[PDB]
């Protein structure tokens, strides 16, 4: 029941098309209210709320620190991008694909993949079924993998083969798992 | 397309709790363990590809603490509003009897960043074998967190992820069974 008081500082490096365009957003947040920020597109501190006004004024009066902050897209954002690139931007983990009837409802389970961009498609006798398709969407597991469920509503015939197909940057040929019963 | 790297830090009173972490596209690259004063990589392989000087983060946290104390007074001692967590329990992969798997407790959209998380197997707490991430940042300046429990699936056993936060009226129990 003791009251709490929280301060957060965030340096956000935003990268567009590799390091072609970089934007730094430094944010100060008291409790849940962002109070002051440095935006590299702006080039100086701006207060977001009345709380941040003394900070914007005072910090902007410091010319060397402002000039270092303006260089930060290079000395900081692009630098750290360069260091982490091979194991972050370039990280590739191959999905595990499982197909099973749901506990008339077929489930394609795709798990343990990275990065998050993926295309999952359902086939019935080699032809794509685009209707009756429901997806759980992207799920971040917190350990640098994602998972997803893609469901197909069907009425299975006796000799039908349903195939789940997974396109992902980690696999040069899209993966396929067949199901029939 | 777009990538984002965030250096996210916090200090919290009266708990005197600090955090320093890097986030890439919503995943933790590393954090600094305040007690041990050491860099801890989220995927331990990252530690063979890069280094990070823990002392710089400790200096930052001391700045954060001092800034929090200034703001606390300036806000006229306005405390944070508790926002309770949403809790979701899922598994690493489709469960198969006896095949090692992981229960994942996803705790999301909450502040302040203090939570008590306990796994329950058949009503009884699980005291060893668990692991967890630090608090991860959100764009709305709330937090998320993941807790993990490796297990052997079995229709017999049941599990709950029990979550306590000042924003809740009582422990939140998210249930799972084969």
């Amino acid at each position: 029941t003791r009251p709490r008081f929280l301060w957060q500082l965030k340096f956000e490096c935003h990268f567009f098309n590799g390091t072609e365009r970089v934007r730094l957003l430094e944010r100060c947040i008291y409790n849940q209210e962002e109070s002051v920020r440095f935006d590299s597109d702006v080039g100086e501190y701006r207060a977001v709320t009345e709380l941040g006004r003394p900070d914007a004024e005072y910090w902007n009066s410091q010319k060397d620190l402002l000039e270092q902050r303006r260089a930060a897209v290079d000395t900081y954002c692009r630098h750290n991008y360069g260091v982490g690139e091979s194991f972050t931007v370039q990280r590739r983990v191959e999905p595990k694909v499982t197909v099973y009837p749901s506990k008339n409802l077929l489930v394609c389970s795709v798990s343990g993949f990275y990065p998050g961009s993926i295309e999952v498609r359902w086939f019935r006798n080699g032809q794509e079924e685009k209707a009756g398709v429901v997806s759980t969407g992207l799920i971040q597991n917190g350990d640098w993998t994602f998972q997803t469920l893609v469901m197909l509503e069907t009425v299975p015939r006796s000799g039908e083969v349903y195939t789940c197909q997974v396109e992902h940057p980690s696999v040069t040929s899209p993966l396929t798992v067949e199901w029939r019963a | 397309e777009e990538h984002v790297i965030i250096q996210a830090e916090f200090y919290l009173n009266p708990d005197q709790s600090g955090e320093f972490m890097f986030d890439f596209d919503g995943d933790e690259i590393f954090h600094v363990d305040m007690a041990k004063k050491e860099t801890v990589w989220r995927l331990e392989e990252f530690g063979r590809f890069a280094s990070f000087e823990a002392q710089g983060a400790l200096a930052n946290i001391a700045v954060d603490k001092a800034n929090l104390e200034i703001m606390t007074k300036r806000s006229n001692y306005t405390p944070i509003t508790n926002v309770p967590p949403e809790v979701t329990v899922l598994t690493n992969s489709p469960v198969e009897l006896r095949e090692p798997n992981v229960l994942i407790c996803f705790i999301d959209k909450f502040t302040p960043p203090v939570v008590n998380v306990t796994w329950l197997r058949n009503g009884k707490p699980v005291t060893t074998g668990v692991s967890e991430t630090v608090f991860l940042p959100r764009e709305d300046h709330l937090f998320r967190k993941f807790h993990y429990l490796p297990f052997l699936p079995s229709t017999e056993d049941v599990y709950d992820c029990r979550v306590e936060h000042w924003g809740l009226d009582e422990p939140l129990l998210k249930h799972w069974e084969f």
């Binding site: - | 250096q7 990070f52 954060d64 800034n67």
Partner: peptide
């Protein structure tokens, strides 16, 4: 007075 914290840097390891 309110202090500006430092944007900190990772550095690459040999291999």
């Amino acid at each position: 007075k309110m202090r500006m914290a430092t944007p900190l840097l990772m550095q690459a390891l040999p291999m």
